[model samples]
Target: MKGSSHHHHHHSSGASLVPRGSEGAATMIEVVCNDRLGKKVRVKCNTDDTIGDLKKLIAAQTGTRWNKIVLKKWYTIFKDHVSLGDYEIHDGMNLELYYQ
Candidate 1:
């Protein structure tokens, strides 16, 4: 009769996985165009993004051609193949834009 009594133990363990913050976070930059209106365009992009990527974003908003857009800061001209982080660009920074 004692053999008829059986004990069963069930273990159900469910772990919740949490997501971590992204390494390359997006930053907001202000582009001041060298036009008669002195337009200031704000664009948000990741630091890993290239100068060309930024130009496309600005062009979309300003209705200008991406290749015609020139981005610079003081005497430092931003290159298309270069990443924003390589140029030391940060959030809330201002970039001068000119039409070529």
Candidate 2:
């Protein structure tokens, strides 16, 4: 007497995607501020820097008070403590400028 046997094997291949900021050196990204006066302020900063840090840089160049300045992408307002990378801000990105 002979018996029939069936065997099945399943293999899965999966790759995970990693987010930025895993490198040793910080990345430099340029952000452009579109002001109401039609003046653009280009700020170059590290991707690890916070919104407050970028505001300070912008203030130095534009003569605007850092604390009084507001950075926005459409209706989304950027907070001071949040980092550029957290907001998904990349190089050559445009942000709206408003006064508090």
Taking the candidates one at a time, how many backbone clashes does each contain?
A: 0, 0
- List the RMSD of every prediction in angstroms: 20.4, 18.8
lDDT of 1 by residue, 33-84 (tens): 5443655677766554578877877787788887789987889887887877
**What TM-score would every model get versus the actual structure?**
0.64, 0.72
Which model scores highest in lDDT?
A: 2
lDDT of 2 by residue, 58-80 (tens): 88788888777899998897987
Ten-residue segment with the worst summed lDDT in candidate 1?
A: 12-21
Distance (Å) between predicted and true CA of 26, model 1?
Answer: 6.0
lDDT of each: 0.67, 0.78
* Model 1 stretches astray by more than 4 angstroms: 1-36
| TM-score of structure candidate 1 | 0.64
Question: In model 1, what are the clashing residue pairs, if there are any?
Answer: none
